Design a protein around this ligand. Structure first.
Ligand SMILES: COC(=O)C[C@@H]1N=C(c2ccc(Cl)cc2)c2c(sc(C)c2C)-n2c(C)nnc21
Ligand SMILES: COC(=O)C[C@@H]1N=C(c2ccc(Cl)cc2)c2c(sc(C)c2C)-n2c(C)nnc21
Length: 110
C-alpha cells in the first residue's frame, strides 16, 4: 500500500523530470545555488530549501513514509519559489506550470 504509493510518487517525479516539461521544470531540477544566483537573503527568507534532485534522493533513501510526505516536499519546493519571488516573475509562472502537472498526477494516485 505505502510501497505502491511511493512507487507512484517516483513515477510522478520522473514525469516532472521528463523532456515534455523541461521548458518550465528546469529551474527546479537542483538546489538553488544562492552564490551563483546572487541571492544574498535567500537563506534568511527560505528556512527549508527544496528541489527535485533532493526529493529524488530522499525517495531512493526511503525517507518518505507515505505519499503525503512526498507531496509535502513537492509543495514546499513550489511554496519557496512563491515566497521568495515577485508573483509576476517568470520563475513563478514556471513553478505554477510544473505544479499543474504535479497536482494532477498526485490527485489521481490510488
Ligand atoms: C536570480 O534568481 C532569482 O531571482 C530567483 C531564482 N530565479 C530563477 C530563474 C529561473 C528561470 C528564469 Cl527565466 C529566471 C530566473 C532560478 C531559480 S533556480 C535556477 C537554477 C534559476 C535560474 N529560482 C528558484 C527555484 N526560485 N527562485 C529562483
Ligand atoms: C531590478 O530588479 C527587480 O526589478 C526585481 C528583482 N528581479 C529579479 C529578476 C530575476 C530574474 C529575471 Cl528573468 C528578472 C528579474 C532579481 C531578484 S534577485 C536577482 C539577483 C534578480 C536578477 N529579485 C527578487 C528575488 N525579487 N525581485 C527581484
Amino acid at each position: 500500500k505505502v510501497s505502491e504509493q511511493l512507487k507512484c510518487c517516483s513515477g510522478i517525479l520522473k514525469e516532472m523530470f521528463a523532456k515534455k516539461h523541461a521548458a518550465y521544470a528546469w529551474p527546479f531540477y537542483k538546489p538553488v545555488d544562492v552564490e551563483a544566483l546572487g541571492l544574498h537573503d535567500y537563506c534568511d527568507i527560505i528556512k527549508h530549501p527544496m528541489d527535485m534532485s533532493t526529493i529524488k534522493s530522499k525517495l531512493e533513501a526511503r525517507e518518505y513514509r507515505d505519499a503525503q510526505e512526498f507531496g509535502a516536499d513537492v509543495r514546499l519546493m513550489f511554496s519557496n519559489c512563491y515566497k521568495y519571488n515577485p508573483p509576476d516573475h517568470e520563475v513563478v509562472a514556471m513553478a505554477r506550470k510544473l505544479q499543474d502537472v504535479f497536482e494532477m498526477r498526485f490527485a489521481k494516485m490510488p
